[PDB]
A paper describes a structure:
Fibrillarin (FBL) is an essential and evolutionarily highly conserved S-adenosyl methionine (SAM) dependent methyltransferase. Fibrillarin consists of an N-terminal glycine–arginine-rich domain (GAR), which is believed to be important for organisation of the nucleolus, and a C-terminal domain with a Rossmann fold that is characteristic of class I S-adenosylmethionine (SAM)-dependent methyltransferases. In the present study, we determined, to our knowledge, the first crystal structures of hFBL in ligand-free state, bound to the native cofactor SAM, and in complex with two fragments that can compete with SAM for binding to the cofactor site.
Only minor changes are observed in hFBLSAM compared to hFBLApo upon SAM binding. The aromatic sidechain of F192 undergoes a significant rotation upon stacking with the adenine moiety of SAM. In addition, subtle movements in the sidechains of E191, D236, Q239, and R218 are observed upon cofactor binding. While SAM binding showed an overall stabilising effect on hFBL structure, it appeared to destabilise the loop W137-K143, with the binding site residue R141 being the most notable.
Numbering used by the authors: 86 to 100, 105 to 318
The structure:
Amino acid sequence: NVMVEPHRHEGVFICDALVTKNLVPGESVYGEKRVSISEGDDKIEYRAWNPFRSKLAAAILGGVDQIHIKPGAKVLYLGAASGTTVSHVSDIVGPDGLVYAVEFSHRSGRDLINLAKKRTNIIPVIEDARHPHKYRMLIAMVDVIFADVAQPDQTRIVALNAHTFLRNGGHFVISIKANCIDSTASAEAVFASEVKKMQQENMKPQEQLTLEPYERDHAVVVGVYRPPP
């Protein structure tokens, strides 16, 4: 019998409970259940990925077609907060991948620094994502931008970082909480507005989905950056 099986998305696994292969066997990050499977000389530990705490997990269980975060990927994560979702991105991309974890708050910043001590593939960037000039000498060109900044001007911020850092034909994964962008617009009016802005900055949405039952009026938009010459 196979307990934990590869998910469709490479680097992800399903036990329906989503899990990622633990980069730091023995350690939990936010009190998540851990599941170690030993057979003979082999051994592999997984980490439970809670969809009520991670918008990315909620999107995966909601049936998103692509996440682009994959083994070996270079990921710029905007809005890294304390590292909950970032820790699972770190598992997915693996030792040959890279996760830049940008977060403004220095409180969450300290949780991120502790998380990165264990995970070599995390770079904490405790800076304001509005001003990429302050940190662009630290960021090699990335394959994916994941954004969860939760601001009304989130999309311009994300686009500013994509212009600087995202490779052509690179992808983005943007989490949009409607009442943080504009609590007096309907969720459909926010999502349509934000998707339009993306398209105007050559961030071409390829798919979108909401996150019920885990979150209300919360969308994830996945797409591709195809900038001009």
